[PDB]
Amino acid sequence: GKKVLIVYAHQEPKSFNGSLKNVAVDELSRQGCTVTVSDLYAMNFEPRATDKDITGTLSNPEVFNYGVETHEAYKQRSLASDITDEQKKVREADLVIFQFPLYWFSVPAILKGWMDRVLCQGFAFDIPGFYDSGLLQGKLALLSVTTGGTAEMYTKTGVNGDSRYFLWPLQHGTLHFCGFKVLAPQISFAPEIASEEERKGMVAAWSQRLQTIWKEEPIPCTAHWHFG
Amino acid sequence: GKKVLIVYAHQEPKSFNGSLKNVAVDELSRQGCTVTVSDLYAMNFEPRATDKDITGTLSNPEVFNYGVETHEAYKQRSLASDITDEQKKVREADLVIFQFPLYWFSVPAILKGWMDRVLCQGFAFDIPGFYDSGLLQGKLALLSVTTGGTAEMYTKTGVNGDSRYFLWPLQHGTLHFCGFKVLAPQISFAPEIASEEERKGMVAAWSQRLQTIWKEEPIPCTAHWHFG
Numbered sequence: 373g374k375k376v377l378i379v380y381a382h383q384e385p386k387s388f389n390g391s392l393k394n395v396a397v398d399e400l401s402r403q404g405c406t407v408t409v410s411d412l413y414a415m416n417f418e419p420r421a422t423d424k425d426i427t428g429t430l431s432n433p434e435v436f437n438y439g440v441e442t443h444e445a446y447k448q449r450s451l452a453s454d455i456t457d458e459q460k461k462v463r464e465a466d467l468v469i470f471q472f473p474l475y476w477f478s479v480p481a482i483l484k485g486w487m488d489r490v491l492c493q494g495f496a497f498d499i500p501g502f503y504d505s506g507l508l509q510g511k512l513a514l515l516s517v518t519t520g521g522t523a524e525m526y527t528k529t530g531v532n533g534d535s536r537y538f539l540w541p542l543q544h545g546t547l548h549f550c551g552f553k554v555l556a557p558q559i560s561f562a563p564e565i566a567s568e569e570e571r572k573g574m575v576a577a578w579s580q581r582l583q584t585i586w587k588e589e590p591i592p593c594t595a596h597w598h599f600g
Numbered sequence: 601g602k603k604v605l606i607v608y609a610h611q612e613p614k615s616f617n618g619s620l621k622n623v624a625v626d627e628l629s630r631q632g633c634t635v636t637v638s639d640l641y642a643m644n645f646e647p648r649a650t651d652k653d654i655t656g657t658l659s660n661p662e663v664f665n666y667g668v669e670t671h672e673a674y675k676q677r678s679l680a681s682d683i684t685d686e687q688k689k690v691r692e693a694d695l696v697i698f699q700f701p702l703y704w705f706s707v708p709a710i711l712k713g714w715m716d717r718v719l720c721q722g723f724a725f726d727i728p729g730f731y732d733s734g735l736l737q738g739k740l741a742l743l744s745v746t747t748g749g750t751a752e753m754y755t756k757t758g759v760n761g762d763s764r765y766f767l768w769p770l771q772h773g774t775l776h777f778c779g780f781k782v783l784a785p786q787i788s789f790a791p792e793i794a795s796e797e798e799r800k801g802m803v804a805a806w807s808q809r810l811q812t813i814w815k816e817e818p819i820p821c822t823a824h825w826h827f828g
């Protein structure tokens with residue numbers, strides 16, 4: 373009985389991202405999984421890390437330090453409820469899928485804000501308690517990314533460099549840091565210029581992969597895997 | 601008679617980041633440069649890429665495509681005023697300094713939002729204007745980042761990998777792509793754990809570097825620079 377959270381970052385339900393999110397919901401639901409989706413734009417999710425994220429007395433009201441104050445607020449249970457709502461979803465999930473279009477070799481800012489605000493010290497990691505010792509150990513994560521650039525542009529000898537290069541801050545710096553094991557990324561290249569049949573093939577490839585997702589092992593989330 | 605824009609992303613004026621920003625203002629002003637600062641948190645800068653970024657009639661009101669709509673709005677002068685205000689500052693600038701604490705191997709979401717929303721097609725890049733040919737060619741950009749991790753953690757074989765690894769999406773995927781020549785990053789490692797004299801040393805290095813910033817040559821912003 374597996375639980376899945378999909379954190380979804382696209383403005384348009386009819387988009388290629390919307391279709392990938394929906395096929396994931398359909399297929400995981402068909403399998404009998406418990407499925408939850410955080411539709412960040414529809415939630416008008418707050419991306420900014422501010423003192424509003426702490427709802428009670430600050431430990432140093434003279435000089436605001438976001439990391440210190442959110443860590444303390446997590447322990448005291450005085451974080452803003454939008455954050456703790458997301459933490460509950462993550463805590464319960466066996467697998468977290470992130471579905472998003474690549475923006476500037478990274479995640480859209482609304483999703484960056486989810487990472488910044490939800491993955492606070494005490495919840496996602498501690499010092500010590502990170503990388504293999506991260507607090508979300510035992511959980512799986514998977515990035516399902518769409519791009520403007522073609523697969524060929526995203527090779528070692530391409531203009532954009534290899535696709536694994538841009539995965540490093542997300543897979544290693546964020547997910548592995550918090551203790552997740554990382555499943556191989558799903559990258560759907562350049563749907564805007566793909567043919568209708570090619571688009572349909574990309575969506576079907578994702579649905580098909582999800583059929584056996586619970587049999588997969590994570591990647592070795594290392595510099596070598598990313599950079600060779 | 602050089603013009604500088606500083607895009608600043610910290611919540612707290614008394615922070616190490618705040619001090620680095622003020623030192624830059626003081627020193628560049630002293631030189632007689634024209635200086636502008638976009639204090640993103642103080643501006644409550646909007647990070648989310650949404651249909652509110654277009655003020656005109658949408659080019660396709662049935663299916664919302666952020667990239668297409670903003671490209672068209674740029675050309676028709678119908679982008680939201682917060683975006684066009686930032687574009688004016690960038691257009692006039694000879695150098696753009698980004699001052700920020702590293703969040704998840706990247707920029708804080710509020711600054712990611714500035715990148716997502718300000719650097720639109722038609723303004724910062726186009727077909728064929730990208731990388732060396734990007735539309736902001738002639739301009740210089742510089743990342744001034746502070747970290748939680750020590751320099752030793754940011755080595756090739758260290759836990760975090762080389763600091764150059766996380767710079768790739770920002771320096772190459774973003775700044776170089778838009779035509780910026782990228783000056784060497786200013787990395788102020790672990791100020792929270794540095795001693796008082798080490799902190800003063802890091803600030804002094806920055807102020808001193810700023811004295812001769814106009815004599816610098818851009819880095820070769822290549823995959824080899826970052827990973828080789």
Ligand SMILES: Cc1cc2nc3c(=O)[nH]c(=O)nc-3n(C[C@H](O)[C@H](O)[C@H](O)COP(=O)(O)OP(=O)(O)OC[C@H]3O[C@@H](n4cnc5c(N)ncnc54)[C@H](O)[C@@H]3O)c2cc1C
Nearest residue numbers: 387388389391473474475476477518519520521564571667
């Ligand atoms: C701010 C910004 C920054 C960006 N930075 C980068 C970058 O650094 N690198 C990069 O490579 N790209 C970048 N891009 C491009 C971006 O990644 C792509 O535009 C995006 O991934 C396309 O996905 P989409 O869901 O929006 O496509 P869509 O435009 O929604 O989809 C394309 C087509 O697929 C169709 N479609 C939807 N569902 C189906 C279906 N089930 N079967 C058949 N077709 C279907 C749609 O109708 C549409 O015609 C950036 C874009 C923006 C706006």
Ligand SMILES: Cc1cc2nc3c(=O)[nH]c(=O)nc-3n(C[C@H](O)[C@H](O)[C@H](O)COP(=O)(O)OP(=O)(O)OC[C@H]3O[C@@H](n4cnc5c(N)ncnc54)[C@H](O)[C@@H]3O)c2cc1C
Nearest residue numbers: 439615616617619701702703704705746747748749792799
């Ligand atoms: C959401 C989040 C994600 C993060 N992700 C990462 C990550 O992926 N990798 C990583 O390495 N770190 C990460 N960090 C840590 C973060 O990068 C550091 O905490 C930040 O860079 C510290 O900079 P600061 O300006 O906030 O330091 P501050 O705490 O504000 O300053 C440090 C000290 O220097 C002092 N100081 C200020 N001005 C001067 C001055 N003029 N001269 C002498 N001392 C001065 C201050 O008073 C303070 O005591 C993350 C933090 C958060 C909140």
Ligand SMILES: COc1ccc2c(c1)c(=O)c1c(NCCN(C)C)ccc3ncn2c31
Nearest residue numbers: 476477520521532564667668720721773777
């Ligand atoms: C790193 O390589 C990059 C960097 C930034 C990019 C893109 C690629 C990019 O491809 C892209 C885009 N593509 C689709 C164009 N037509 C097909 C709709 C649309 C908007 C937009 N805004 C920023 N970026 C955009």
Ligand SMILES: COc1ccc2c(c1)c(=O)c1c(NCCN(C)C)ccc3ncn2c31
Nearest residue numbers: 439492493499545546549704705748749792
């Ligand atoms: C990738 O390496 C990472 C990733 C995420 C990190 C950090 C490092 C990090 O150092 C850090 C942090 N440091 C100061 C805490 N102590 C030093 C007071 C505070 C908050 C916070 N939230 C996320 N992260 C934080």
Ligand SMILES: [Zn+2]
Nearest residue numbers: 544548593594
């Ligand atoms: Zn890793």
Ligand SMILES: [Zn+2]
Nearest residue numbers: 772776821822
């Ligand atoms: Zn480059």
